[PDB]
């Protein structure tokens, strides 16, 4: 048996390196980014956004963001995804993002996902799994999103009720917002201190 | 096989989220502990990118940013292969690499090191592993470069690398080294992991039979992600 | 012989408040330092058990709570002697153990773990110590069980004991392990214990010659507490 | 010489344990509990009760908590009482409490102490010591309860002196309450954070 | 590939028939040596047994006989490979096994040991290696037992089993123990053994990144058995 | 190359967890036996029986024996049988039988075995290959069987002939009787002392 | 304290019955395994030897049995513990010797070696251990001498002895030797016993301090026994 | 922990330097011997007697044997008895004797012994505990003596039922006898060979 290979921090370029055509350098003719939605992905259209704050409250601007979904009807565009069930064609279920330079806003198009079976036999809420890179972070941050308007499924969600200080679940639910007819889900992560939003080990 | 979930990461074999003498870490790790939860369909899928997608020169940093001419410095291949903790090959593995220049250099606005930039080199690259998990690319060695820990700290020499494969579980940024730099033992980045086992799993070793005469030397790289158990009583992933 | 005070607990001889890698213990421990204080009558005294109030199958965790059978279990008798640092043997101190049954389970609605409940097991004990310090208790050796710290955490075997003795500053609380247990060298809770040979003095010894043939085996394990010393001059307590 | 066993934390489940009727887990005939008061016992008669908080502000309900006091007379029913004075005789001086599992709050039914001499001459204001054992606590914290209405006692009481942080001393003194008849003492204790109780190596 | 015979089994590496102090061998070991042939086809051939007369239990001793619970004691998974002595794997072998309860118990009115019975508990498996000679089955972890060689002996836990494979002189029955296990370095039956390598050899080992969380513990073990020889010149087997 | 795992006694209880059944223990449908006749097997019914004694000349109780053998033309129901011929396909070849608990005698009801090619090009007489487990056993001991009602045959196989003590080749013999109509073959094993059986290493 | 029975005699502490280099050995050792029994009262009784019997130069073979002279040879005292295996003292154990004399010569018709005899020498003595398990007797030292094994062997210096205690379990008849007797080496005899850390246990040593000047020299010599266990649990003795 | 002494042959001339008398070693006034009969000695007298013989047959004359035994009602003259029955004050248990150098009978005057209590409230048959030393043995042989006329006794004696070859338990019955009005009874042993006498670890 091996050890797997040890974490370092993605540094100071991690969301330049990873988002190259963002920083001008035009090496690729395809580039990931953060729009999940193509013209026939199925599901209600929301924007992902917020920002994240360090222990002193102020914003990062060099954090690198990727998020992982399911499709609008809770299954995974992967091979591992046991449910049987056929996934949408036209979506990735991941995508990429920086924060901007200046702002220090991060954001998200995609689609809100579909409920995802739990373990045995349980239903999971939907909820979006996100992880943060940047410099000063030596291992990735694992976080969910989950959404406040599913109130009730968010009530029986095994992985929120898993937290035993429910003070702390609330750190893991977006606000709904509509702008201009757009649903927009505003997340802000603290790291550190006040409200630090909850990071699991997975 | 029915596959259970991934193993659990060993955190001692990792650096803390907090270490004091990488100071950038003070204010951005967390006070309270991670929580652990038991794996689901989220944890043990990721997604899959298909080969059409990536261009000729993808792995190619010395020509993918070629404009009038070659960039200046050492020419390198780095190859080597990507397993699971039980040795399994990881296949179709997306891997990124990003990095400095010979002078240390990273070409972005923000990076005002005196060491010069080379207008014929980028410092981003791309591949996915084959079936046997095997990966290879060609760039430039990066220069070591100073940067604001301690006045005078300095980074060895390194290529920054990030891999995404079949679980989000097993998504993993880090940087690797190569043989013989001796800023390595200075390095509080390095210094974070706490192990010197593990210390030494981050450096790309020499492999002088694979250097390709007048031409290139090569380093051998190997990385190891989190492996899945199989199920062969009740499976409760779902 | 004029008692004074108790000599002062050696702090590095403990675990610290604050051990991350015990994920329970980073919001439970205190953020300022422990206040030193001279002891005065109030650390020196505790009070006295007597041993009128304990039945006759209080030290025998296998009948105490047998109803139709006995448990199912391996048969262990466990004995040893508690003494103080200067090594003056301990005596009517009152011994507490507590532990879960032979699948890792505690007898509570709370323990939810899968290994099956022993109808015919209840898991307390307690006994007072002799005038040579003496304990002896018999069980069914505890099985190691999951619990969550990471998700795969797994406890060794082992048995929670507290002594209330002559002193309140003796007060004590922990948990002894079993000889050639593999789970004790990757254990968090006692990987708190600073030095290695501190860690060793938890673990219960094989008393191979102890034996009671065709019927159990033996442990031997001492406890040591705070001593006082004696005051030959000025005495300040009072 | 030797060094003392080293502590261990008491775990999830030593509220249960060590109170097993509590845990419905009847193997003892004689069991030991939260009331010093038997009929004979002299003194005024009053209930402390409190709570114990976590660094988030939440109450643990797997705490186990023990009192160790002074009859009236500030005489202790311990060998080790080198007063030479009588201790009366229907107080044990010593009791054992979990919180409730729901509520959180942990009582004990006492009596209020007399005062006790301190080293060379001095004399301790009237004070119950007090220990705390829970899942994520290595070692017993100790601490000491001191009474609002003890104020003229309390300023000369060469412990809380030894305090040098005055604005610590207070987080010892429980307040004195009326309900219907009885005296109550509150004592919250706060194990991390603001308002952190002090806690003595002892 | 044309096939010869078997490899000469090692006479030092396994007990020999006579061991003093293993009483019962003493009235029941040849007193001549035995007499070794060259191998026929009745040598070289084994019995096939087909997957169709399993049931889907039969590797599970936690439930195969569980009637109103489960059995009382530690769960733990024990797999591994059969391989033949040249490393190639050994498919297709009927491999069964036999253990006492978590007391120390078997099932059996022979056994008068107090420990106690459980009623939930069988401790009887079988299974077919795979393709890769790889087997897993899943059990309670058997109690060391007093039994009466010298009064007070006792054996450490142990896992009986036996392997029909290939040919008839591969043919092995042993006991498999627990590493840790302190009763291991005392036992006159293991002491039959006269290398300590081989000792070793019927340890299974810890294996911690197979435990599967809030559930059971993993132990891995392998076995070789004795292995063919190729023939390229003269075939005498017939 | 790796060593051959090493051999320990079966122990007590062998003749009761590898036959269960017998033993009250049933956990399988599909039991193995000492039965080796189907209904359509080929071959003439024979019944082989005896006892196992010890160097006291007591029979074993606890032992535990498998038998080996061929059809009735001398083929082995095995993958490795090199023949070229067919197998009698209602034939296993194997069996396992312990002793009864009180009389002590052990009983097979199989066919008797054809002859089967011996090494280069010779003809072994007819046999069934025995092996022996039992407590105080420390390693399986293999004999074989022989017919007394082939002479001619058993005078001419290799392996009786490779033990130059040919006193003892007898003790490979074993005796014919008709019981009612039945063939039954009286085979006795004696593990140590006077007319102590051949064993072989193979 | 309610005591239970004697802990089992460690056969591997002992030389085995069956010992081919003493030749005498191989007639006189059974051919089956000895029987071991759960002890009895009749195990864990045993003689009481009163004191008054015995007489004031019983533990003095220097002048037990001198008739005209003193015995010629080296006088020397012995002395030592008789303690249990868990250190108990053996308190009014018969303690019995015998020896040979100076010239390895024994007082009997069947000793025909040519050693010379000494009419002022017997060579037996006696003594009850004292409340502490102190022995202690005086004699001249025996001389090496020759036996017939092989034709040259040679006996080191030794002194034959004998105990009665408290428990017939305990019994043990053996002999001593003297410390740097290069015969020790040697011996078939000793080598009888099978571990060197035992061998050691039956060599005298010399006790310096001890030697009473222009008088004798002194050697001291203890002696373990079997122990008994205490009982606190169920007493099956009877 | 201390390991016990270890044994060593009592050597040949075990049986001269333990019966000194015998030998005309005349050191003590009061010497041990084969008698346990003192004048009121309670019980009936009996003689008991035989020979030792080695593994060819032939008698042993340097062997020295001792046995031990209970009074007439089964009650040790031992402090470790706990019967709570006052055992006959003129009554050693214990005897010491040589074997005649040229016949090699050896004998004792004793007493049969009563029934001692066995473990877990069986009760033991009568029977004298014996040990042998000589020459050429290397720890004392320890066995029993049981009598031919307590058949019924005998057969539900714990010790002998332990003994599983039924046929060995025999050798420990010791043959009853009347030479002229003296009950007598013979006790061969042998050490070696067919009959061999059980020897005990106890
Ligand atoms: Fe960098
Ligand atoms: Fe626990
Ligand atoms: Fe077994
Ligand atoms: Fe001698
Ligand atoms: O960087
Ligand atoms: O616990
Ligand atoms: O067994
Ligand atoms: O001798």
């Known amino acids: ?202 | 096989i029915i596959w259970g979930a991934y193993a659990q990461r060993n955190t001692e074999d990792h650096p803390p989220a907090y270490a004091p003498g990488y100071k950038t870490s003070v204010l951005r790790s967390p006070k309270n502990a991670l929580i652990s939860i038991a794996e689901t369909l989220s944890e043990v899928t990721a997604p899959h990118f298909s080969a059409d997608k990536f261009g000729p020169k993808d792995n190619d940093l010395i020509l993918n940013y070629a404009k009038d001419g070659l960039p200046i410095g050492e020419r390198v291949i780095v190859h080597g292969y990507v397993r699971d903790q039980f040795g399994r090959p990881v296949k179709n593995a997306l891997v990124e690499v990003w990095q400095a220049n010979a002078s240390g250099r990273y070409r972005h606005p923000n990076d005002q090191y005196i060491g010069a930039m080379d207008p014929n080199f980028g410092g981003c690259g791309r591949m996915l592993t084959d079936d046997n998990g095997y990966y290879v690319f060609r760039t430039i060695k990066p220069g070591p470069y100073p940067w604001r820990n301690r006045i005078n700290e300095w980074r060895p020499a390194h290529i920054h690398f990030s891999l995404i494969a079949d679980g989000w579980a097993q998504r993993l940024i880090s940087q690797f080294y190569f043989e013989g730099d001796t800023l390595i033992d200075s390095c509080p980045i390095l210094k974070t992991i706490p192990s010197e086992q593990q210390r030494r799993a981050l450096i790309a070793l020499e492999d002088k039979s694979n250097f390709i005469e007048a031409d290139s030397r090569c380093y051998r790289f190997d990385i190891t992600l989190r492996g899945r158990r199989a199920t062969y009583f009740e499976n409760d992933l779902t």
């Open chain 1, 1 to 202: 048996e091996l050890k797997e290979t040890p974490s370092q921090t993605g540094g100071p370029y991690v969301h330049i390196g990873l988002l190259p055509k963002q920083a001008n350098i035009e090496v690729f003719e395809h580039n990931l980014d953060n729009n999940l939605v193509q013209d026939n992905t199925q599901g209600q259209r929301i924007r992902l956004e917020g920002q994240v704050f360090d222990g002193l409250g102020l914003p990062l601007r060099d954090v690198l963001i990727e998020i992982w979904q399911a499709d609008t009807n809770g299954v995974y565009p992967s091979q591992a995804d046991t449910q049987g069930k056929q996934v949408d064609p036209n979506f990735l279920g991941w995508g990429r993002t920086g924060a901007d330079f200046g702002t220090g806003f991060w954001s998200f198009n995609t689609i809100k996902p579909g409920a995802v079976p739990g373990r045995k036999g349980s239903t999971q809420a939907p909820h979006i799994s996100l992880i943060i890179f940047a410099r000063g972070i030596n291992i990735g941050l694992h976080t969910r999103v989950y959404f406040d308007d599913e109130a009730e499924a968010n009530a029986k969600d095994p992985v929120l009720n898993s937290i035993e200080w429910a003070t702390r679940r609330q750190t893991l639910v977006a606000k709904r917002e509509e702008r201009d007819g757009e649903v927009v889900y505003r997340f802000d992560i603290r790291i550190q201190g006040e409200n630090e939003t909850v990071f699991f080990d997975i």
